[PDB]
Amino acid sequence: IFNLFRVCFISLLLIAAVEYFKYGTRINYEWFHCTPIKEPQSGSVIKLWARGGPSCDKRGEYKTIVKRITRDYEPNDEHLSFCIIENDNVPPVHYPIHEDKGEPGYVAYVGYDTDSELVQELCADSTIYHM
Amino acid sequence: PKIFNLFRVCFISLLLIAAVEYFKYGTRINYEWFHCTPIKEPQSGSVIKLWARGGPSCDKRGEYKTIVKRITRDYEPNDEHLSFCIIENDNVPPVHYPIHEDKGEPGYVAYVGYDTDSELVQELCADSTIYHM
Amino acid sequence: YREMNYRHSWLTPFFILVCVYSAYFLSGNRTESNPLHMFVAISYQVDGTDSYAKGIKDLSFVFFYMIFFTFLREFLMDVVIRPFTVYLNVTSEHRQKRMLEQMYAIFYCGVSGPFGLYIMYHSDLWLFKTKPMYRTYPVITNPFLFKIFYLGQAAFWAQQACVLVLQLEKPRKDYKELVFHHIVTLLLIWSSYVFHFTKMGLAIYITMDVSDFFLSLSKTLNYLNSVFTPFVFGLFVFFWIYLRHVVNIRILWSVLTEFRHEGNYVLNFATQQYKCWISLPIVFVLIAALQLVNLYWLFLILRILYRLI
Amino acid sequence: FREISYRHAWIAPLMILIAVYSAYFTSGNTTKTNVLHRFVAVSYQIGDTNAYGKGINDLCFVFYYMIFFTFLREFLMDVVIRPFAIRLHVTSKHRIKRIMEQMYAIFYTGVSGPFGIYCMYHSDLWFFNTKAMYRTYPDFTNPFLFKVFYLGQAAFWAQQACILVLQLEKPRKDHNELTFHHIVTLLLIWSSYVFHFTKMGLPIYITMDVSDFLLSFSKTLNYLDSGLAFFSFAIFVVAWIYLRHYINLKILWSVLTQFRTEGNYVLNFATQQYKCWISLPIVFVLIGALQLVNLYWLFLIFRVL
Numbered sequence A: 001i002f003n004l005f006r007v008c009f010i011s012l013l014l015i016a017a018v019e020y021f022k023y024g025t026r027i028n029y030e031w032f033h034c035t036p037i038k039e040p041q042s043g044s045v046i047k048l049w050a051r052g053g054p055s056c057d058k059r060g061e062y063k064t065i066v067k068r069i070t071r072d073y074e075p076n077d078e079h080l081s082f083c084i085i086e087n088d089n090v091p092p093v094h095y096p097i098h099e100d101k102g103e104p105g106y107v108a109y110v111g112y113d114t115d116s117e118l119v120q121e122l123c124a125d126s127t128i129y130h131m
Numbered sequence B: 001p002k003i004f005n006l007f008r009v010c011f012i013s014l015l016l017i018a019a020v021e022y023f024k025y026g027t028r029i030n031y032e033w034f035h036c037t038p039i040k041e042p043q044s045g046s047v048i049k050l051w052a053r054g055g056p057s058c059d060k061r062g063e064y065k066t067i068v069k070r071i072t073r074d075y076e077p078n079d080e081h082l083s084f085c086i087i088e089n090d091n092v093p094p095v096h097y098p099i100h101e102d103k104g105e106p107g108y109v110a111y112v113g114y115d116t117d118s119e120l121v122q123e124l125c126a127d128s129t130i131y132h133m
Numbered sequence C: 001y002r003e004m005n006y007r008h009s010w011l012t013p014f015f016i017l018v019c020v021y022s023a024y025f026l027s028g029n030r031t032e033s034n035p036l037h038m039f040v041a042i043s044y045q046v047d048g049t050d051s052y053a054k055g056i057k058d059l060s061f062v063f064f065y066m067i068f069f070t071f072l073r074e075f076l077m078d079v080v081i082r083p084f085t086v087y088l089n090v091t092s093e094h095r096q097k098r099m100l101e102q103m104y105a106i107f108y109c110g111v112s113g114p115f116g117l118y119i120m121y122h123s124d125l126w127l128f129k130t131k132p133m134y135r136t137y138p139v140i141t142n143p144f145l146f147k148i149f150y151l152g153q154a155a156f157w158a159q160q161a162c163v164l165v166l167q168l169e170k171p172r173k174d175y176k177e178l179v180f181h182h183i184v185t186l187l188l189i190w191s192s193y194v195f196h197f198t199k200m201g202l203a204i205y206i207t208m209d210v211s212d213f214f215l216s217l218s219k220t221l222n223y224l225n226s227v228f229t230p231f232v233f234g235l236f237v238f239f240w241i242y243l244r245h246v247v248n249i250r251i252l253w254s255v256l257t258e259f260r261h262e263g264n265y266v267l268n269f270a271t272q273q274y275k276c277w278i279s280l281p282i283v284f285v286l287i288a289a290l291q292l293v294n295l296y297w298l299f300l301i302l303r304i305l306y307r308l309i
Numbered sequence D: 001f002r003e004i005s006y007r008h009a010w011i012a013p014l015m016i017l018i019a020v021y022s023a024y025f026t027s028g029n030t031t032k033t034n035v036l037h038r039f040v041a042v043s044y045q046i047g048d049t050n051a052y053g054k055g056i057n058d059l060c061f062v063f064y065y066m067i068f069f070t071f072l073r074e075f076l077m078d079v080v081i082r083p084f085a086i087r088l089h090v091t092s093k094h095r096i097k098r099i100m101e102q103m104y105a106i107f108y109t110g111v112s113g114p115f116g117i118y119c120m121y122h123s124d125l126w127f128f129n130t131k132a133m134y135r136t137y138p139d140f141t142n143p144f145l146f147k148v149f150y151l152g153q154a155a156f157w158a159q160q161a162c163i164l165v166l167q168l169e170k171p172r173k174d175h176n177e178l179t180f181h182h183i184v185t186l187l188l189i190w191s192s193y194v195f196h197f198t199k200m201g202l203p204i205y206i207t208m209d210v211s212d213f214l215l216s217f218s219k220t221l222n223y224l225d226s227g228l229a230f231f232s233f234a235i236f237v238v239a240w241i242y243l244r245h246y247i248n249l250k251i252l253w254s255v256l257t258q259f260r261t262e263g264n265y266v267l268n269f270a271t272q273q274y275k276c277w278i279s280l281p282i283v284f285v286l287i288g289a290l291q292l293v294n295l296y297w298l299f300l301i302f303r304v305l
């Protein structure tokens, strides 16, 4: 009885354990597939895009870009400005398996507002988003 | 063994100490899940107006994270490619939401729809940048 | 009732099944909206097409049909085969009880086996075709019958593992192998279903089921005394070698030469595409481990075959 | 060799103490870059300011000074306290064992209280100011003294809890009572730091230490037959009354009132703003549970009266 309950409980935990792995990986897939790459421009400003294989699709880059924008900068310390520039010249799935990748499908320039003017120069015509 | 009883407490304690450090880290990176409520406003077959609601802790970052989280989860680009835009309400500061229910305009709204309604997402975006997924 | 409950152990599960089935059908809707459809039928049908997805209700189907098999297990015992063993006049408490364990193995191996073949016949996997195992991977949704098969086997082997862990009868010297057989069979059934390897696992399950059918049928006659015991045992070696070794080796080889070339091979967590260079060692290890166990069993059958001669 | 390692139990942890200090000091780095700094000194200093952040190196500091307190405990008992009992002509070995922990208790709380009131004095928490407990919340960084105090105090109680867990001497009537105290103080020390409630935990801890010090001083004078025991114990009841009840009740009232009025009362996980309507019951019941224990303990003191 109790032994069965333990067998059932541990088995159901394994079921739930595997389910969350499938769910979490499917939901945070960009973490496993998209490597954020930084190019510090000046001050707090950086150029930001994600790199990876076929699974690092445009959505994954955007999620990867947003993650570091929203984690490497604390608006409650200082307000920040950023822009995410889509690469119109690649499809959502563009990155090949091998390391000779092309232009990223998404790029972002993000910096603290003390550097606001710089972000605008690097963002050019792209909309400036504030956090 | 007495020494075993030492390690099980030093394991139980460190577990507790880390569980809390994960709680204080996990809630801080996922704060928008606690503080921002995603308000979805359907517009057409796949297009929805998408924004977030909350208190002062629902930063403009929280809305953007909340809106992005839904664009990137409520829509599957591998099933069908996705079009969206995020429009900033530049008439409010990044911390704008009051504690009470008379929130006012959100700091961010996004119109997102599958590519079948891409022409329709374009219309609602009203010359905002259109992002593709 | 209580007196009937003890003598006819199947009564209690039988009452639940007839009640839930009656409640489900008396509800009128008899569709996915019914809370009892959570249990009595398979859920997550893809619109009206013959393909069902996976989700929490699958366990509700499995749990409910653990009760169903608990009835069927105990019902066939008390009403069908135990009288048959008395009709055969075994006249031995231990020998008869074991012969029951094997006779029940005929009923379910003799039903699931042909069912797995009927499913696989109505599929592109026919005759253990290893390419289809991978072309359509991930198979996130299953046909009606494959979902019925996988959850039905998960429901069946969960019940068998459930009663075994309860130890309602004093464990025998082979209890360890029964635990391993049930826990490993459940793990393979669950892993293949959860990770969208149902097409691969149906072929492997058919081999393990079909060979077992002949194992129990061969073993059953060994408990008896008939001229058919060597004949069925001879049929068993043919089916064991062909299914547990020839087919499973061919499935093993495909995990090394069609895991990569058939279907998508780029890992993509977004799309649940787990067939990649990381899963290949795992699938190979699992199937190879099963074959290694099969080889150990093959050693037993081969030495028991020399003792037969 | 093992004979010396036995007669002097403080040899065992003096080796690591000497190695690390000598290894740390001899090296020319002696800053946060050195490997031993995360063990020997306070980590996560911000700039040249006196405020220090929190992090895992605060667990390497605790663990390293758990060795120091394991040296300090056994060294003082095996050098000064145990001879002090022998040179005091104590007639009972069981009493000798008990006066070991109290005489050590007089020491460690007798220097902790003075350190704690020193920390509070050099802070705007002086006079047990409940306003300061909440105006600046969250306090993600701490003064040098604060982090040394709490991380040193958590090291001290972690080794005392550990020694109790390994039961160096199993038989003890109040082992369950001590085990509870050691665990509680190590939960309130940790919980208040990790949740940025160091300023509110400092006064609560100071009341515990200053009262504990006079409890131990009174108790030792009870074992050490002297007329001073009652006079010292009299100062304990008044100090206990003021510290465990008047101060803690004032802190409890501020939890009910000033926890909601001073500082930010809007929950904000982004900024770790846990001072809100949710943490209010948690903070109240935790201090309230502490007060109820003090209420029970006050009754026992009155029973002694």
Ligand SMILES: CCCCCCCCCCCCCCCCCC(=O)OC[C@H](COP(=O)(O)OCCN)OC(=O)CCCCCCCCCCCCCCCCC
Pocket: A007, A008, A011, A012, A015, A016, A017, A019, A020, A022, C053, C054, C055, C056, C057, C058, C059, C060, C062, C063, C140, C141, C151, C154, C155, C158, C161, C162, C186, C189, C190, C193, C194
């Ligand atoms: C050994 C004794 C008996 C032990 C149990 C019996 C053995 C079981 C053997 C295997 C049988 C089937 C088990 C798996 C069925 C449910 C898990 C599953 O497949 O979930 C997948 C589903 C996601 O679906 P998928 O298609 O993978 O991707 C998303 C779809 N677009 O996932 C989800 O979205 C939901 C994830 C579910 C997480 C919860 C995990 C289980 C926790 C317990 C719940 C119990 C309540 C329901 C069951 C009641 C009866 C017990």
Ligand SMILES: CCCCCCCCCCCCCCCCCC(=O)OC[C@H](COP(=O)(O)OCCN)OC(=O)CCCCCCCCCCCCCCCCC
Pocket: C030, C031, C040, C041, C042, C065, C068, C107, C108, C109, C111, C112, C113, C115, C148, C149, C151, C152, C153, C156, C157, C209
């Ligand atoms: C040893 C084998 C013994 C015999 C096993 C097979 C017996 C079949 C009958 C058992 C009792 C259940 C009878 C039917 C109950 C209600 C079914 C029902 O409502 O319809 C089928 C249901 C969904 O149908 P419906 O709601 O119509 O929706 C789809 C079409 N619109 O979907 C369903 O079909 C759900 C119910 C399926 C019932 C069988 C499930 C398990 C069978 C798995 C194969 C055998 C397992 C044995 C394992 C041994 C091998 C080791």
Ligand SMILES: CCCCCCCCCCCCCCCCCC(=O)OC[C@H](COP(=O)(O)OCCN)OC(=O)CCCCCCCCCCCCCCCCC
Pocket: D030, D040, D041, D042, D045, D065, D108, D109, D111, D112, D115, D148, D149, D151, D152, D153, D156
């Ligand atoms: C009483 C028991 C209960 C606890 C009560 C609370 C008080 C005691 C707390 C635990 C003991 C002290 C722990 C922390 C002491 C060292 C703190 C520290 O960081 O040292 C500063 C010192 C100066 O250099 P630093 O400041 O690192 O460089 C500039 C950038 N900050 O850093 C260095 O460069 C040197 C590295 C530190 C060396 C410390 C040597 C300690 C020697 C014994 C100390 C005894 C403490 C107790 C006092 C009574 C002892 C009988």
Ligand SMILES: CCCCCCCCCCCCCCCCCC(=O)OC[C@H](COP(=O)(O)OCCN)OC(=O)CCCCCCCCCCCCCCCCC
Pocket: B009, B010, B013, B014, B017, B018, B021, D053, D054, D055, D056, D058, D059, D060, D062, D063, D140, D151, D154, D155, D158, D159, D161, D162, D186, D189, D190, D193, D194, D272
């Ligand atoms: C025996 C000790 C262990 C010896 C080995 C040392 C290494 C252990 C490694 C395993 C355990 C790791 C647990 C997780 C560590 C925390 C991770 C971390 O960096 O968390 C950050 C956090 C500070 O957060 P903060 O930086 O302020 O927030 C971001 C900016 N807003 O940081 C923190 O707030 C964490 C602070 C931790 C220190 C707590 C101080 C009190 C300790 C109480 C004593 C515990 C003793 C346990 C053993 C004995 C029990 C009887």
Ligand SMILES: [N+]
Pocket: A031, A032, A033, A034, A035
């Ligand atoms: N990664």
Ligand SMILES: [N+]
Pocket: B033, B034, B035
């Ligand atoms: N929420």
